[PDB]
Amino acid sequence: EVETFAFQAEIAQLMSLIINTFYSNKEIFLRELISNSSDALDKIRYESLTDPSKLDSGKELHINLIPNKQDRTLTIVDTGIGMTKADLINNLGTIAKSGTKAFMEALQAGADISMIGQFGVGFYSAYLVAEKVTVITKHNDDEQYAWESSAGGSFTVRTDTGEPMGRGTKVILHLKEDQTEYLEERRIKEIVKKHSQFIGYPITLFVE
Numbered sequence: 001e002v003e004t005f006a007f008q009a010e011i012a013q014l015m016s017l018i019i020n021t022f023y024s025n026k027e028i029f030l031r032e033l034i035s036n037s038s039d040a041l042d043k044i045r046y047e048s049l050t051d052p053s054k055l056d057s058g059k060e061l062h063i064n065l066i067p068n069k070q071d072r073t074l075t076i077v078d079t080g081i082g083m084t085k086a087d088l089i090n091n092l093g094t095i096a097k098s099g100t101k102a103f104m105e106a107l108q109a110g111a112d113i114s115m116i117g118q119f120g121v122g123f124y125s126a127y128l129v130a131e132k133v134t135v136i137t138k139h140n141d142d143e144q145y146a147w148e149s150s151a152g153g154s155f156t157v158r159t160d161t162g163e164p165m166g167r168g169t170k171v172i173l174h175l176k177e178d179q180t181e182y183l184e185e186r187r188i189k190e191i192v193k194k195h196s197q198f199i200g201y202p203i204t205l206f207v208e
C-alpha cells in the first residue's frame, strides 16, 4: 500500500526554485542535512535526560555518511529522535509553509540559496544534487516508514519492512548524473571539514 500526496503549493514552489535556479554552490546540501540530523540527535539527547528508556531503541548518537557509486546514492544516516508518519506527511516535521514564506521574503531582501537553513526548510536543498530523495524514519512512538519524492509536486509514503533501523532517519540521495563528485571520499571529507567541522556528534564517512 503506497499513499500519494500533493505538496502544499508553497513547498512545490520552493522545490521548483531549488531545481531550476542557477546556483553553483550546491555542496551546502550536505551541511543542511547534517544540521537536520544534529537537531534530531539533540532532541533525543534532551528527551532521554528525563526518560532514559527512550534510548532502549539505541544508545549511540551519531551520523553516518554512506556513498554508493554503483547505485549512485549518498545516504545520510542518524540515530536521532526520528519522525512519525504524521511528521513525514506534514513536511518532514518542518514549518515549511511559514519557513518558505520567510525564505522567499529574505531572497528578495538580499539572501542567497545557502541561507535556506535559517528558515527551517534546509531539507529541500537535497534537490540541488538529487533527482530523487527517499527518507526512511523510525520514531519510538510509531512504525518505520519510507517517504519518497522526485519532486514534480507529489510525494509518497509507505511502510518500510526492509532493514529495521531501531530509531532515527536515513536520507537517501539518488544523485543527478552530473553530481557524482559527492560520492568521492576526498570531496565528502572536504565539505564536512569546511561546513560541519564542529558538529557535536561523530560523523563517520563510510568507504567502499
Ligand SMILES: O=c1[nH]c2cc(CNS(O)(O)c3cccnc3)ccc2n1-c1cc(Cl)c(O)cc1O
Residues within 6 Å of the ligand: 033, 036, 037, 038, 039, 040, 041, 043, 078, 080, 081, 082, 083, 092, 093, 094, 095, 123, 137, 168, 169, 171
Ligand atoms: O527525524 C527527525 N526528527 C527530527 C526532530 C527535529 C526537531 N523536532 S521538534 O523539536 O518537534 C521541532 C519541530 C519544528 C520546529 N522546532 C522544533 C528536527 C529534525 C528531525 N529529524 C530529521 C529531519 C530531517 Cl529533514 C533530516 O534530514 C534528518 C532528521 O534526523
